[PDB]
Amino acid sequence: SMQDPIADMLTRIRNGQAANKAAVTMPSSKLKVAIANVLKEEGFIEDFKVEGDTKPELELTLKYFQGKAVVESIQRVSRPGLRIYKRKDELPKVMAGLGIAVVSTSKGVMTDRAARQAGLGGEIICYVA
Amino acid sequence: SLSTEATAKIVSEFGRDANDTGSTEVQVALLTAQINHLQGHFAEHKKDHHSRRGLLRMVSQRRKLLDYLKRKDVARYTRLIERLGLRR
RNA sequence: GGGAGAAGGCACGCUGAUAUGUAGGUGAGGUCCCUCGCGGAUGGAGCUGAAAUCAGUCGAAGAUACCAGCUGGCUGCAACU
RNA sequence: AUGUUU
RNA sequence: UCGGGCUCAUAACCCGA
RNA sequence: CUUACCACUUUGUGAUUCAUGACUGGGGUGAAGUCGUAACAAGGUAACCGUAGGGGAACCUGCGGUUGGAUCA
RNA sequence: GUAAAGCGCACGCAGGCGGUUUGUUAAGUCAGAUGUGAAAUCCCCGGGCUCAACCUGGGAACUGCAUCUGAUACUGGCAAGCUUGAGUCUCGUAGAGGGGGGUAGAAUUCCAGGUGUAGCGGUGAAAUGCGUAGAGAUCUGGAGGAAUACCGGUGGCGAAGGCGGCCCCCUGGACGAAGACUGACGCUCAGGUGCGAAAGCGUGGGGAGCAAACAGGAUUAGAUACCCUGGUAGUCCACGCCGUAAACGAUGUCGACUUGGAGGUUGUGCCCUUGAGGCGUGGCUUCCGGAGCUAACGCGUUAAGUCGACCGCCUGGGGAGUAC
RNA sequence: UAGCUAGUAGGUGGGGUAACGGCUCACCUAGGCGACGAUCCCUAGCUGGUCUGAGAGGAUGACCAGCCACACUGGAACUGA
Ligand SMILES: [Mg+2]
Ligand SMILES: [Mg+2]
Ligand SMILES: [Mg+2]
Ligand SMILES: [Mg+2]
Ligand SMILES: [Mg+2]
Ligand SMILES: [Mg+2]
Ligand SMILES: [Mg+2]
Ligand SMILES: [Mg+2]
Ligand SMILES: [Mg+2]
Ligand SMILES: [Mg+2]
Ligand SMILES: [Mg+2]
Ligand SMILES: [Mg+2]
Ligand SMILES: [Mg+2]
Ligand SMILES: [Mg+2]
Ligand SMILES: [Mg+2]
Ligand SMILES: [Mg+2]
Ligand SMILES: [Mg+2]
Ligand SMILES: [Mg+2]
Ligand SMILES: [Mg+2]
């Protein structure tokens, strides 16, 4: 938004699915995709397209199961002026491991799993679930 | 406001490049002008607690945008103010 | 603005040194300059001369004489000269 | 107007 | 002041003496 | 012996804090005291806010504002 | 929002926060290593007292601090930019936006003159008050002050307070159209600065109407009121001051999103324009309401929905927004 | 409590300590500290740790152990590692 970008992103999706929306959109950004991969490649979205070599556009194709949405439990965390950082023995574990928390480790951003799997900490992001 | 015939003049004098309304050089000059003019007007009435606000809004921007220079290309800042004697 | 010299205190002589008399003040030669002299600049001889700090010293006492606010607190009245 | 009473 | 009325009841109000 | 520093201690003048003080502002309790009835219904002049003046008391009145106002205005 | 709680409103320093891409740095951060964080409590396992209390071995632990070397995703710094944020230019658009200066017509009051005569005015009735010194009414002339009917509206403009006849001058903001230019220059903001309804205060002016105070008349058991007759401050102006309000959407500002329906108002593109109109797209604005939110009432794309940046504030009632 | 501070902040050279240093002295500059809260007022020995608590957090610092300070009150130096 007119301050913190990513914040809006996580919202856009949670909002859309809230009203069985097709697929919300937002101006794509390198960090936006790094968090996008951990969605399509982590089972949470169909896929994301692009548009604009100079004026990009992210496209998170939401999903829904039986009679409810898929990604129905997302929230930001390491927001500005409150950024959170934790060590390996502090790493998160979204909803008792049942969920996932995007973590921007020194070795690229990746799901909570790859965090311990790779053995290292990173800028915790959201609590996808 | 400044006569339409005015702005188009100052710009061709301060505008970083031939005919351009956007750079600080042009921004400032275009502002300082209306500020210097209104000064006399305000020397009259002086009760217009409304028109004066605009005087501030734009003046508050003068010192404001003038900073952009420092925070950015300082080489021109001094070269720009030395033109209208501003800051002093 | 005042009240306020509120109140209440400290130091005050003299000798020597800093400095053979100091800072400051005054300013003669000599040099320079130009209408060119009741000129200027520069020069600092001489003259004069506070004040401070040290150290030392005499008496009972150094603003020693003459001279020269007593001070504060509560209240009436009337602004005030 | 009041009622533990204009 | 008193006696009667008015009110659920007081005062007030009305009547009478 | 002398000087320097300095303790006990002396003096003046303020700051601060505690206790106390004739009388007194407002406040709080308490005995079915006396005077009203201001407010809650359109509370019987709709109420309240600022503010100003006045009156035994609630309060009254003026100016602006609010609805946190009744009726078929 | 209404339970305690959004400064009355703006501007803005510090402070906090920061669209996007690349390069660089490696400070925040992550990884591993090392010193070090006394022992003893504590805890895990295990021993010694007959058990237990207690005693005791080892280890874990001691978030910590620093240092060494690495990692570079995000954050921060530097360099280079980019454009959607924000800003300038052009042309227009509406409006009670503001300050100043003139001017207009209706009406009240007063004064004057004619006509005309025993009432007017007021109230629930009355009375005070005004009338034969001729009112009231009716007509003619003049003075003055304040306010701008109809328009006018859920209408408009403004940060808020607030701002209406007409005209001129000076002047602030908003909005739409094409592009052109700037190139994150932005958001918020303790303190600080400025604006502030009404009443009130100081100086000098002004004074028709209304009216605190006050004086009569009336009502009443009383009536320092409500009602009537009068009426001073004030209400008006210029300058200066006070800064309060149920300064109210009782809802801080900015930005991003999430069904829709009818109306208002104001730009602009377009359709036999071929109509009033038919279809778009913006700025602001009412009523309704959907998911959701909510203790409920209700709010509902102008949120009280879902998110983020910054700030202000709340923490039982009375005492008291009082005392010092 | 919103201002605070002259050996005060720094610089020269003397002096001094076991040793750095206004530690002290002379002179010189006029600094230094403060809302990231100085100065001032009240209170208190600090820690490991202790209690409580799911944890974060809150409360606490007796006996055990480390550190500091004190020894009738105020002051001072002597001996000596
Ligand atoms: Mg007497
Ligand atoms: Mg006299
Ligand atoms: Mg009674
Ligand atoms: Mg009684
Ligand atoms: Mg007392
Ligand atoms: Mg009543
Ligand atoms: Mg009433
Ligand atoms: Mg409340
Ligand atoms: Mg507000
Ligand atoms: Mg330990
Ligand atoms: Mg970077
Ligand atoms: Mg508006
Ligand atoms: Mg006024
Ligand atoms: Mg006045
Ligand atoms: Mg609704
Ligand atoms: Mg030295
Ligand atoms: Mg103690
Ligand atoms: Mg708990
Ligand atoms: Mg002793």
Q: Treating both helix axes as pointing N-terminal to C-terminal, what angle do B74-84 and B51-71 enclose, rounded to 10 degrees?
A: 140
* A129 neighbors A69 (Cβ within 8 angstroms): no
Strands A103-105 and A58-59: unpaired
Cα B38 to Cα B49: distance, rounded to the nearest angstrom: 14
Q: Strand G: which residues 26-55 of B lie within 7 A (CB)?
A: 26-27, 30, 34, 37-38, 41, 44-45, 47-51, 53-55
Q: Strand G: which residues 69-98 of A lie within 7 A (CB)?
A: 75-76, 78-83, 85-90
* B52 neighbors B22 (Cβ within 8 angstroms): no
Which of B53, B71, A53, B47 is CA-nearest to residue B24? B71
- Convert chain A into a string of H (helix), E (strand) and C (coil): CCCCHHHHHHHHHHHHHHCCCCCCEECCCHHHHHHHHHHHCCCCCCCCCCCCCCCCCEECCCCECCCCECCCCCCCCCCCCCCCCECCCCCCCCCCCCCCCCEEECCCEECHHHHHHHCCCEEECCCCC
CA B9 from centroid of its chain's CA atoms: 14
- Extract the tokens encoding B24: 């600080």
- What one-character-per-residue DSSP string does chain B give? ---HHHHHHHHHHHSSSSS-S-SHHHHHHHHHHHHHHHHHHHTS----TTHHHHHHHHHHHHHHHHHHHHHS-HHHHHHHHHHHTTT-
Q: Vertex A8, ends A92 and A118: CA angle to 5°?
A: 30
Q: How far is the CA of B33 from the C1' of G115 (A)?
A: 72
* A59 neighbors A48 (Cβ within 8 angstroms): yes
Indicate if CB(B11) is under 7 A from strand G: yes
B30-69 b/e with 16+ CB inside 10 Å = b?
bbbbbbeebeeeeeeeeeeeeebeebeebbeebeeebeeb
For chain A, domains (ranges, CATH) are: 1-71 (3.30.1370.30), 72-129 (3.30.1490.10)
Indicate if CB(A52) is under 7 A from strand G: no
Terminal CA-CA length for chain B: 25
Q: What is the resolution of this structure in A?
A: 3.2
Cα A81 to Cα B22: distance, rounded to the nearest angstrom: 33
Experimental approach taken: X-ray
State which amino acid sits at residue B6: A
Distances (CA, A) of A60 to A19, A117, B41, B86: 15, 27, 57, 52
Look at the alpha carbons of A68, A9, A1, A105 in this order and tell me if their dihedral is positive or negative.
positive
Please name the residues in contact with A70: beta carbons below 8 A apart, sequence gap of 6 or more.
Answer: A17, A44, A62, A63, A64
* A36 neighbors A48 (Cβ within 8 angstroms): yes
